[PDB]
Amino acid sequence: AIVALVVAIIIAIVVWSIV
């Protein structure tokens, strides 16, 4: 895993916000 998923997922979402 959830950790690696949270990071990869979290970032993926972020990049979308910025962007």
Swiss-Prot record:
Function: Enhances virion budding by targeting host CD4 and Tetherin/BST2 to proteasome degradation. Degradation of CD4 prevents any unwanted premature interactions between viral Env and its host receptor CD4 in the endoplasmic reticulum. Degradation of antiretroviral protein Tetherin/BST2 is important for virion budding, as BST2 tethers new viral particles to the host cell membrane. Mechanistically, Vpu bridges either CD4 or BST2 to BTRC, a substrate recognition subunit of the Skp1/Cullin/F-box protein E3 ubiquitin ligase, induces their ubiquitination and subsequent proteasomal degradation.
UniProt entry tagged with the keyword Nucleotide-binding: no
Domain notes for this protein: The N-terminus and transmembrane domains are required for self-oligomerization and proper virion budding, whereas the cytoplasmic domain is required for CD4 degradation. The cytoplasmic domain is composed of 2 amphipathic alpha helix that form a U-shape.
Post-translational changes noted in the entry: Phosphorylated by host CK2. This phosphorylation is necessary for interaction with human BTRC and degradation of CD4.
Cell compartments where the protein resides: Host membrane
Organism encoding this protein: Human immunodeficiency virus type 1 group M subtype B (isolate LW123) (HIV-1)
Subunit note: Homopentamer. Interacts with host CD4 and BRTC; these interactions induce proteasomal degradation of CD4. Interacts with host BST2; this interaction leads to the degradation of host BST2. Interacts with host FBXW11. Interacts with host AP1M1; this interaction plays a role in the mistrafficking and subsequent degradation of host BST2. Interacts with host RANBP2; this interaction allows Vpu to down-regulate host BLM sumoylation.
Highest taxon listed in the record's lineage: Viruses
GO molecular function, one term: monoatomic cation channel activity
Disulfide bonds: none
Membrane-spanning parts: 1-19
Full protein: residues contained: 7 to 25 of 81
Other notes: HIV-1 lineages are divided in three main groups, M (for Major), O (for Outlier), and N (for New, or Non-M, Non-O). The vast majority of strains found worldwide belong to the group M. Group O seems to be endemic to and largely confined to Cameroon and neighboring countries in West Central Africa, where these viruses represent a small minority of HIV-1 strains. The group N is represented by a limited number of isolates from Cameroonian persons. The group M is further subdivided in 9 clades or subtypes (A to D, F to H, J and K).
Location (main, coarse): host cell
Coiled-coil region: none
Phylogenetic lineage: Viruses, Riboviria, Pararnavirae, Artverviricota, Revtraviricetes
Name of protein: Protein Vpu
Any one GO CC term of the record: membrane
Keywords: AIDS, Apoptosis, Host membrane, Host-virus interaction, Inhibition of host innate immune response by virus, Inhibition of host tetherin by virus, Ion channel, Ion transport, Membrane, Phosphoprotein, Transmembrane, Transmembrane helix, Transport, Viral immunoevasion
Family stated for the protein in its record: Belongs to the HIV-1 VPU protein family.
A biological process term (GO) from this entry: receptor catabolic process
